[PDB]
Design a protein around this nucleic acid. Structure first.
Lengths: 58, 211, 142, 175, 38
RNA sequence: AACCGCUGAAAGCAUCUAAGCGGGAAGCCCACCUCAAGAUUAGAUUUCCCUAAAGAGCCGUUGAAGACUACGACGUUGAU
RNA sequence: UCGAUGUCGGCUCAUCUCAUCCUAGGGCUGAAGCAGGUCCUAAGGGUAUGGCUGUUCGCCAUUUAAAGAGGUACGCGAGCUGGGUUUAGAACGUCGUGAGACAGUUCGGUCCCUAUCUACCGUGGGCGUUGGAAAUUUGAGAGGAUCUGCUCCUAGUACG
């Protein structure tokens, strides 16, 4: 469920889930998929900034 | 492609001068009053609605009384629709008239009616099943259905298997029947053949579709 | 903190119009199936219908590649012994144009009450017009 | 080879290309062919060179057939095509009356054939049909259709046959 | 004609022609040389 | 479908085929008969009615309708 | 599968396959015609009655356009039969000293079940179908049906 929500959120602004997780790993962001899906569902601006970090890292 | 509704009056014969007897059936044709003309714009298809016969006022609902009043006709015993085309919707106006003139002598017609009802019937009469042995040790299965399937494969009865059930009392059409004589002042339609149903039943006579 | 579901009363289904003109049958069908399920939304929960209404026009103009227009077979059994019937993609496009895309999407949706409820949001029409200007669908090139 | 051969345009004839549809207009009439989407058509001084859009076997095989069809259209508009059918048989005869030709060959009934729009038949004698057309395709189709009512038989040669058609002959009552 | 798995030109007037992805031998000299693969 | 083509290149020829255009079976899809909107996508049209209405049902007399049902007819303004 | 899955044949009732028996369309032919022979397509229909034997089969008689090959628990006994096989009686031949035995034969010899579920054939009740009602209807679909002889005529012509 969390992975599906994060995939929806990342595709909403930018890249796919796989590239997003790679970008987080490169950015050294330790946030787990549970919190990530919670932010995707409940805080679209914060998830946008979080996606921008992963996108800047690749 | 439009027909008329009549009542089966019974069977008789017509003799020809050569001395051939023609089995005929007599149809009373009351006036077929036109109650509604259906067109493609309003209904999506073309049809003529007619009524024939009578009902007393106490037996006609307010909805049907208004339906008949809109046409300007008297309530009939039923209401019947005939699918038509632009050629058929020529002189046919609401409240108009359809008589036995619709058919000519020697014209082939299709006649539809409710068949005589035989009620619950076994396979022997309903489907021409063979009887099993009357003697020769036959137990209590003389008019039995016999086997109703195969073994484990398929392990069921196939749909549409012939069995006992209600026989007759269904809509049935007989095609290729000849108009022996038309009379319109008396509302007489004499047709060669059998005409499904009993005397007093509702019959529909249309031009023959085989042609 | 917990993981919340979408709360059907709080969900809104948006209306979109898709032109299936010359598009590949299955390539469009997958996109439509995802939209009907609601997988593009961050509130996606597999037990709630979070999808969107998809209105497909030019459904008779959808395309298949190869020799599939004449070799793609549609079988059905009528329930009667020997009652197996087959039709072509081209014959089915001539006869019931919407059924090609409806069949493709029904194959890709989950098979159960919720899937039946999500296929009910697919409004697909042969021709350039749909009777849903009241819903104001937004053009969606997918 | 066929594709690389240019199509020489006589003085009367002319070709125009409007939205992938080549029209050849001249003294006999007007013909038209749909230009394949893998072939390009360019005109020079009284000649038409048509070449593949890309250097490929498929494009060359399509420009060969476009060239052949265009050349046939040009010749069929500058002078037309003509085909001859012969009838062999005791009571075999043909009569051309307008666009409809009747044949009494061997049936309990004469056969009536309506020529396609673009083919004209005349019967100088009663056992010989002359067909004339602008396009070789429609001429050949009409000839085949007429000839197919009674194709030639090997044992006596009876039937409708093409002029200068080799009919195989077999011997009846062999040992 | 002869419908068989091995279709080969017989005389020298036979042609190998393939139509609809299927191999035929068509002969202009001997009508019983006509073959189709299958 | 098999099969027979027309024109036609790949493959200067030939060639039913690759582009294109034809013929062709009791077979396929319609057409014929019956059923059919629980086709839950439950469709259409005409009328009628809404402070118990329009109607439907019970009940009764009943029918070439019928196992029971249902269905058809009629109940004094009446030939059931 | 042995705390039981009844055997052969017949009857009744079928359903499917196609490697097609007839009917339909064809190519080749040592195809003149009429008839065929082969192979390709084709499963829509249709596809005997009797004599013998328990027979399936098989032979035979007479037909038919044809008398197809198969699968379906060698379909079908909680649908029927019970002639054979395969209990107990008895006998013959044969084997055994014998009790007995024999894919040897012969005469005789109990076939149960009121149907819960699935299926199927019919026929109702309920609810729904965006207020209710009486009628008339479109048709997404489904089922049924689909066989074929002979005579005349073309014409005693084409062919020979």
């Amino acid at each position: 469920l969390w992975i599906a929500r994060i995939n929806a959120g990342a595709r909403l602004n930018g890249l796919s889930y796989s590239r997003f997780i790679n970008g987080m790993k490169k950015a050294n962001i330790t946030i787990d998929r549970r919190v990530l899906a919670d932010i995707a569902m409940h805080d679209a601006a914060t998830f946008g900034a979080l996606v921008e970090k992963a996108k800047a890292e690749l | 492609a439009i027909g008329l509704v009549g009542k089966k009056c019974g069977m008789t014969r017509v003799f020809t001068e050569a001395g051939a007897s023609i089995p005929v059936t007599v149809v009373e044709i009351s006036a077929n009053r036109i109650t509604q003309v259906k067109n493609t714009d309003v209904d999506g298809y073309q049809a003529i609605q007619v009524t024939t016969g009578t009902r007393r006022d106490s037996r006609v609902t307010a909805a049907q009384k208004g339906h008949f009043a809109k046409a300007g006709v008297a309530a009939g015993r039923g209401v019947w629709e005939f699918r038509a085309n632009d050629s058929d919707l020529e002189g046919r106006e609401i409240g108009g008239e359809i008589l036995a003139d619709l058919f000519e002598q020697g014209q082939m017609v299709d006649v539809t009616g409710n068949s005589k009802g035989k009620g619950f019937q076994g396979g022997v009469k309903r489907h021409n099943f063979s009887m099993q042995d009357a003697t020769h040790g036959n137990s209590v299965s003389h008019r039995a259905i016999g086997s109703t399937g195969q073994n484990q494969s398929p392990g069921k009865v196939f749909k549409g298997k012939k069995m006992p059930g209600q026989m007759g009392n269904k809509r049935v059409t007989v095609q290729g029947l000849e108009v022996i004589s038309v009379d319109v002042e008396k509302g007489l339609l004499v047709i060669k053949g059998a005409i499904p149903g009993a005397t007093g039943g509702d019959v529909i006579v249309r031009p023959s579709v085989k042609a | 903190m917990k993981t919340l579901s979408a709360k059907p009363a709080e969900v809104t289904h948006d209306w979109f119009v898709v032109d299936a003109d010359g598009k590949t049958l299955g390539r469009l069908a997958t996109q439509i199936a995802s939209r009907l399920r609601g997988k593009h939304k961050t509130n996606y929960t597999p037990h709630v219908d979070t999808g969107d209404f998809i209105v497909v026009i030019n459904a008779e103009k959808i395309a298949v590649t190869g020799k599939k227009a004449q070799d793609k077979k549609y079988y059905r059994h009528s329930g009667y012994p020997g009652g197996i019937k087959e039709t072509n993609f081209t014959k089915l496009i001539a006869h019931k144009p919407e059924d090609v895309l409806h069949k493709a999407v029904k194959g890709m949706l989950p098979k159960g009450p919720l899937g039946y409820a999500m296929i009910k949001k697919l409004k697909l029409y042969a021709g350039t017009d749909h009777p849903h200007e009241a819903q104001q669908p937004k053009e969606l090139d997918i | 080879r066929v594709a690389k051969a240019p199509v020489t345009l006589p003085n009367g004839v002319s070709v125009t290309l409007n939205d992938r549809q080549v029209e050849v207009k001249g003294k006999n009439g007007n013909l038209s062919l749909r230009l394949h989407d893998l072939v390009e058509l360019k005109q020079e001084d009284d000649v038409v060179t048509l070449s593949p859009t890309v250097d490929s076997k498929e494009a060359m095989m399509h420009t060969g057939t476009i060239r052949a069809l265009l050349n046939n259209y040009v010749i069929g508009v500058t002078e037309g095509f003509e085909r001859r059918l012969q009838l062999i048989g005791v009571g075999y005869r043909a009569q051309a009356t307008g666009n409809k030709v009747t044949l009494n060959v061997g049936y309990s009934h004469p056969v009536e054939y309506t020529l396609p729009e673009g083919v004209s038949a005349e019967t100088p004698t009663q056992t010989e049909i002359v067909l004339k057309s602008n396009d070789k395709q429609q001429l050949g189709q009409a000839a085949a259709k007429i000839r197919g009512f009674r194709p030639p038989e090997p044992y006596k040669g009876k039937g409708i046959r093409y002029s200068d058609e080799h009919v195989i002959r077999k011997e009846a009552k062999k040992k | 004609m002869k419908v068989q798995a091995s279709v080969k030109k017989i005389c020298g007037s036979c042609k190998v022609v393939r139509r609809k992805g299927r191999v035929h031998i068509i002969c202009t000299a001997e009508p019983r040389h006509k073959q189709r693969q299958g």
